[PDB]
Design a protein around this ligand. Structure first.
Ligand code: NA
Ligand code: NA
Ligand code: NA
Ligand code: NA
Length: 327
DNA sequence: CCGACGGCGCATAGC
DNA sequence: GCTAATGCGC
DNA sequence: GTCGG
């Protein structure tokens, strides 16, 4: 539905969500407000009262009251006040730097560091992740058009294959479901030599190749199974530079790969629905495995999985393509 | 009334 | 020095 | 903040 419907309500709830997470450090209220915003954003009517909204799952008595106040006055008193509170709006703002969470944002604002310029002048106080997040603050808040995702995928798959043609790499996330834009790039990597029961340089060799061709420009964190960093598409003769983008690469054991691909393809809602059905059929599906449940509820050993299809086959579901996995 | 609400890889105080 | 907890992001 | 056992 068009934002013209309940965009004022949804924006208000998301704003309240951020202050719960970033200022109050109340992650479950942050998720409460988000869930309310999501269910409202799906509702195909311009909401007329708090009681109407309360019929939706995730909207309770308090959000109903807030909606009544927003509908009658066009604002929320509590939101206006915290909006103009110098310290709270600064803590909320600083968490938009990757690497700055609620605790670091609080500590910063406590000692007078409230803006990006303040952070710039205080690099001594920033860890490595935070410095990168600052350097790319604007680029990281930009979306990635799908054409650029295809160009990024071209490079990633080419260089992975060049390191060892037995690697398997899949770009997941909404991109794999067909999305016209993406927030980051999520790469799932495996190799036949790497199983649950089997090697500490499998991920490193791929990261190193991507750094040697100057696709990966920065590293946020790197271990033996997860890389989080920054990359940038190459520009040409006299064209403007592409923004820097967030990329993650995870190395998964071959026998857990398609459980990983399924899970990191999503959507979140599809995942829950698929996991709901799997239970109803006697299986438990997590990020790693699919296991049968005994009649006492006791989980058995993980079943062999060799494609996404196998998982659908186990739970008597027709294979669905990623484009039809929105829910 | 009252606890759950996701769990885990990697970076960076307490002994 | 080692170990575990915590912040962080996803 | 909302849900549900
Ligand atoms: Na409700
Ligand atoms: Na942040
Ligand atoms: Na953030
Ligand atoms: Na080869």
């Amino acid at each position: 539905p068009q934002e013209t419907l309940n965009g004022g309500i949804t924006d208000m709830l998301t704003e309240l969500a951020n202050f719960e997470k970033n200022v109050s450090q109340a992650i479950h209220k942050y998720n409460a407000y988000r869930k309310a915003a999501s269910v409202i954003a799906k509702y195909p009517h311009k909401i007329k009262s708090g009681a109407e909204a309360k019929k939706l799952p995730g909207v309770g008595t308090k959000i109903a009251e807030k909606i009544d106040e927003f509908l009658a006055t066009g604002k929320l008193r509590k939101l206006e006040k915290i909006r103009q509170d110098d310290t709270s709006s600064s803590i909320n703002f600083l968490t938009r730097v990757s690497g700055i969470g609620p605790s670091a944002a609080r500590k910063f604002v406590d000692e007078g560091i409230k803006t990006l310029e303040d952070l710039r002048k205080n690099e001594d106080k920033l860890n490595h992740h935070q410095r990168i997040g600052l350097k790319y603050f604007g680029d990281f808040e930009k979306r990635i058009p799908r054409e650029e995702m295809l160009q990024m995928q071209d490079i990633v798959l080419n260089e992975v294959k060049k390191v060892d043609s037995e690697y398997i790499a899949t770009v997941c996330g909404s991109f794999r479901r067909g999305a016209e834009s993406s927030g980051d790039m999520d790469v799932l990597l495996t190799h036949p030599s790497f199983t649950s029961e089997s090697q500490p340089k499998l991920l490193h060799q791929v990261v190193e190749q991507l750094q040697k061709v100057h696709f990966i420009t920065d590293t946020l964190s790197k271990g033996e199974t997860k890389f989080m960093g920054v990359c940038q598409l190459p520009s040409k003769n006299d064209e403007k530079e592409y923004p820097h983008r967030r990329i993650d690469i995870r190395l998964i054991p071959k026998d857990q790969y398609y459980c990983g691909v399924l899970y990191f393809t999503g959507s979140d809602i599809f995942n829950k629905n698929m996991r709901a059905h799997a239970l109803e059929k006697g299986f438990t599906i997590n990020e790693y495995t699919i296991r049968p449940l005994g009649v006492t509820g006791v989980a058995g050993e993980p079943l062999p999985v060799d494609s996404e299809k196998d998982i659908f086959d186990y739970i008597q579901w027709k294979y669905r393509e990623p484009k039809d996995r929105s829910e």
